[PDB]
Amino acid sequence: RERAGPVTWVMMIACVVVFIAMQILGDQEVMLWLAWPFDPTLKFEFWRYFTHALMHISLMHILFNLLWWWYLGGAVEKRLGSGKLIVITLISALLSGYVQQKFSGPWFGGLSGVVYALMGYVWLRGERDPQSGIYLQRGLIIFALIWIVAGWFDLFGMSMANGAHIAGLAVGLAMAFVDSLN
C-alpha cells in the first residue's frame, strides 16, 4: 500500500518540521541556521550545502514541491532503492545551491532544485533505459513546463531561484545519462 519509502518519508517530515519552525521562530532565524554559508566562518558547517532545500516561506511552493518529491522520489526509491534517491538529492541540492549563490547570493531555499533533478532523471532514465521501470508521464512533463515557465516569467509573485532550478534539472539529466549508459 504505502507508496513513500523511508527516504521519501523523512524528507517530507524534515520539510514540515522546518516549515513549522519558520512560523514559530520567524523566517530569518531559521535562514541564519540553515542557509548556504553566507560567511567564510560558516563554510565548514557542512549541513548548509544541503539544508537550504528544506526551507519554504510559501504555502503553495512547499505543497507543490512535496507533491512532486513524494511522487518522483517515491518512484525512484521504490524501483531504484533508497541509496539512489539519497545520492540524487545530495548532489542536486549541493550543485543547485552552488549555482544559485554564485549568481545571486546565499539567501534562498526550497526543495524545488531536487524536484527538477528528479524530473530530469526520471524522464531521461525512462526515455533511454525503458527496462529500468521508471518513466515520466506526458501529463507531468506538461505540468512541469508550465510551472518552470511561470517561475521564469515571474507569474507567482515571489522571488524565484531560477539558477537552482535549472542547475537541478541539468544534474538530474547528467546522472540519468551516466546511469543509463546501461
Binding site: 532545500a53 545571486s104 534562498f108 531555499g109 526550497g110 524565484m160 537552482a164 532550478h165
Partner: peptide, 4 residues
Amino acid sequence: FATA
C-alpha cells in the same frame, strides 16, 4: 528568499 529566492524560492527554488
